[PDB]
Design an enzyme around this catalytic site. Sequence first.
Site: not given
Length: 721
Positions: A362, A108, A106, A29
């Site tokens: 921006y 999670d 991961d 992943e």
Amino acid sequence: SRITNYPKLEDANKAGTKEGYKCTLVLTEGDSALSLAVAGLAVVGRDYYGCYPLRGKMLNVREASADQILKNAEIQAIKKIMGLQHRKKYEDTKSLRYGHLMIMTDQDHDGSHIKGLIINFLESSFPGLLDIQGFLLEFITPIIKVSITKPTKNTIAFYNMPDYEKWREEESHKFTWKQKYYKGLGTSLAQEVREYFSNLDRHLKIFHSLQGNDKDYIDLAFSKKKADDRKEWLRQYEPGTVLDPTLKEIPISDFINKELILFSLADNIRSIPNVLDGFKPGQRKVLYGCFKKNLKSELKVAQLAPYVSECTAYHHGEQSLAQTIIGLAQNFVGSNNIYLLLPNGAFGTRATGGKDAAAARYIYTELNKLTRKIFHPADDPLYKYIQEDEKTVEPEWYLPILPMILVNGAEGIGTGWSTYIPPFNPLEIIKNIRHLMNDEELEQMHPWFRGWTGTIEEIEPLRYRMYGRIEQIGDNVLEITELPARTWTSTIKEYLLLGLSGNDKIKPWIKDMEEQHDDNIKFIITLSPEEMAKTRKIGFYERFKLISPISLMNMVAFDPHGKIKKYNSVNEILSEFYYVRLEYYQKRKDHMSERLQWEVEKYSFQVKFIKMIIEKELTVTNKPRNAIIQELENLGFPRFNKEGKPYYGSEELYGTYEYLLGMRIWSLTKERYQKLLKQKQEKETELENLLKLSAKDIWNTDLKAFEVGYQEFLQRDAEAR
DNA sequence: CCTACTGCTAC
DNA sequence: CGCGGTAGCAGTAGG
């Protein structure tokens, strides 16, 4: 034979060759995980191991058309690397480029979601593939690492919350220790990484082949037709039902009910707001951050996002948080009735529904002056600040002086549950709050949009129609001056452009169209006399797409106690806010009076301290601190901790005499002494004024302050449009 | 008629 | 400077 189609694939040396069954493909992943996988190859060898990164959230293949699947390069790339095909039912892993598939996510909740999707995909696209025992593998890593610092030194890895929690309550006091949030699966100093691979069998867990009720649970979780069941599925879940850290064997049925369900719960938590502040956690972290920082002067969005993320232990991508900041600042018609952040730049327009916003580097934002009037600072101490990563972050919820969830509404998609709540009028909202304050009947409220000039009519309860404005300004000429709120200009533009030039399927019905928008909507449309008549039969609003519905039939939010609730009326939402808000006002004043009482004590004993020294009743010059401390407690001087709590009895628990000896020598001068007396008198009066008020009195003072603040806000918003 | 799309926070 | 892909739910408009 070697593959060519995929670059990022590290192909096992003996892939699909006589050894293909033995070989293992590690699906990672993300590239962080992938980097770890490839690093692992240097430990376990290329011959029998390969890895291919899953790009992101994998396509759910049930509820997907053969063309949508076929179009998906990711799923295809997998089928080619694994030498996979649909046909018949899979009897043996013999047919394949690989004999085993490993999942590196991961560790999670979103990782679990990926796993579920891979499972779902395999079970669905391939008959009799998951039946093969020991085919599907999982690579797992700890959740939190603890370091024992001043006693006996060893480190403890915890694979779940409950284990770390049972230890935290039943063992942590016995040591000096720290808790670290685990990161990466593609972070850990690569050299530890060599250890994960060296003994990887421990980190490997196998998925048990399909058994009774495994296929049913997969469908429950991933079948587009079972949203209602999932709602129930989540109600059933029991906190602390988590998969056994040490089993080495995972039954799919409880991977789904013990791991996937965890993601689902977390899905709703982040996608659906709390009823009290109308915030999703991401938004609440942004506002908390803006309170922490003094966001009275502006800074850019690309800077604000990481700053909020860092100080609130936000573990997702900053990009998601950036969009959320932008979402809170938007001020075009159809967005925020009240924006708590100011759009200082190209924050998107009504033409595309904000999608025309510029990138975060921006645009800039700061607090709306009004925001602090809505979220009163005096309430901050009352909240329950979530503890995360051995650290404190944003509260469970804020408690604005009016239900902000009604001011702005909300939209979200979770699992099982979903939500839509339209915006309402702050003025009407404040009216009913007054009604409740006075045991009066509530008025009914209807969706209301800041700066919008259309019409909204109720048809059934919980159902409305929303109209734009179309006028006939000439023989054969129509003018559109308003669209239904949440209908973007570009949508109607494309529609008119269609009528003007016609289509493969449909003949043109528009002679000419012009756009003359100013700070408003202005479509000038010309129809041939033929079309005018036709339009009359169809209806001008119907045929120009100037009618939209508003449903109040899916008004979902978490209640004060964190339980997902469906509200059947707007006033229900308001009433539930009102009573918690009323409670916290008495609560706010009781806290303020306590705090003020302590301050008067601190001022009084500082005055006694200086007065005594001046009167020459007490001497500090020399007299070693130990001997000065005794005198102070003998004179009845309380100690004070950092919160400012007094101690009179005899550490943060006990306090110090720093509030006296820590004063600046300046404090001994008469002018300082006089100022100190003024401050104490001011504190006593504050305390006297405070006691003279009721909860409702204070709420009412805040309400009027906001009304004044709101009037100016409306003016600024009209001046800036 | 089933389909496909919108909205939104995350990967 | 910039584009794109996936989940998940309720509803509305499109082929």
